[PDB]
């Protein structure tokens, strides 16, 4: 079983629904999550939502009976109420996404689930040391987003629609081999639009000096491996 | 969706979330640590069969409790400073008991060597000592008439350097849990049994009244209310999960 699966797992694991008849996985991706989803509940009662079409099409082919849809969730809303909105790893990228939960809870039905996991990594190493890259070089006039809200601002704007409301905090533990390890892991995890403004030319200096600062940030352990740390925070509500 | 909610205990909520962590379909030898009256044990029973557990702890009522409410099931009586199994585990489950055992780490380490290979070292301890309500036990303790009257969990990768020589592999996660409350007061009342005793304890009777008061004065300035105003305790919780090499 895959450690990057394991936040999405825990997640469903605080799904207190036996059955689900309309459920959506938001922010499927190309559907690790939804699978979790539909080998939990069924393959024909969850839909896959995502703004991305290339994600769509590889989650519509490793769930071929399952039903996909594109959408931002900004604005998205289901064409019947729901009882499951599950949302794994997608609402950071959303603006505002604490009101656009609350209007969401809006399309469930009574004792429908809203279930969402957010990474809470911007004030990791990893994190710091992509500004004090960009900032620390020659590329930095080119870098010339919000932290997650504390849980009870999640109790604020949901406890007024559901009958309960759960909120914890995980600081997992990843070893890695090394620097290099962490590096390429950040790739998928925002180091990506930092390599995009320092420019092509720049990336072999912007890493560099980036592995640099993540080998000094994160000490090895007995057996040479580093440690990284992935805090993530959960939401779970049932709507009244 | 009303009639297919099924809402678990929330009382043991970090010993399922162990559990669930514990990679054994099944369980010949498991045993339950500091299982107290037999909540944690009743986890392991209901998981792995009551005939496959026994609980132990170093208090004879808490025993008794257990004993009471699993007929069918194994319970003994030892410090777990040194206790080891009479037969090799495939189980060493402890929730909640760690923290109470002097140099926990290594008693840990040597508890491996009594695990089989493939065996599952399963342990949570609560890390509340830097919250707000621990905070305001000394400053209570500090800074009254009774002042004269008056250790934390190690980083994962302690736990990594005590274990993963013994392991195949070993998974540390922390976890901070929210608990709604009703008023300060239900944060006093937790708190009694949460590490409030020994204070008051030190401070004497005739002190009490006047250490609780100022205590919860404290407690109300600094746990912010919610919009519905509610007060909201975290409980911060250190998992380590080790799988014997
Ligand atoms: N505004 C938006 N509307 C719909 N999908 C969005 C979105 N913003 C980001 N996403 C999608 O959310 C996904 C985040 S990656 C997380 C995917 C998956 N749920 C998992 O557990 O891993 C991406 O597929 C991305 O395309
Ligand atoms: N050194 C020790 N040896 C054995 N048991 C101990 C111990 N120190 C504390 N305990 C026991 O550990 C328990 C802690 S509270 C009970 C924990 C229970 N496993 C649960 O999940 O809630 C008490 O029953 C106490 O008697």
């Given at each position: 079983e895959d450690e990057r699966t394991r936040p999405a797992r825990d997640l469903l694991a605080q799904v207190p629904l036996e059955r689900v008849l309309n459920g959506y996985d938001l922010g499927?991706?190309?559907?690790n999550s939804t699978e979790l989803l539909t080998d939990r509940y069924g393959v024909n009662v969850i839909t896959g939502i995502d703004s991305d079409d290339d994600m769509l099409e590889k989650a519509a082919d490793r769930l071929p009976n399952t039903n996909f849809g594109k959408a931002d969730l900004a604005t998205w809303k289901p064409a019947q109420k729901a009882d499951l909105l599950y949302a794994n790893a997608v609402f950071q990228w959303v603006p505002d996404h604490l009101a656009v939960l609350s209007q969401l809870?809006?399309?469930?039905?009574?004792?429908g689930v809203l279930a969402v996991q957010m990474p809470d990594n911007l004030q990791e190493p990893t994190h710091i040391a992509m500004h004090e890259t960009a900032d620390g070089g020659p590329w930095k006039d080119a870098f010339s987003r919000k932290p997650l809200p504390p849980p009870s601002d999640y109790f604020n704007a949901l406890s007024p629609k559901s009958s309960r409301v759960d909120v914890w905090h995980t600081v997992y533990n990843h070893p890695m081999k090394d620097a290099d390890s962490i590096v390429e892991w950040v790739k998928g995890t925002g180091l990506r639009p930092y390599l995009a403004a320092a420019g092509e030319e720049n990336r072999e200096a912007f890493l560099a000096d980036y592995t640099r600062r993540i080998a000094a940030a994160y000490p090895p352990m007995a057996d040479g491996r580093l440690l990284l740390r992935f805090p993530r925070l959960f939401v779970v509500a049932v709507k009244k």
């Open positions: 499927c991706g190309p559907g809870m809006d399309q469930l039905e009574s004792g």
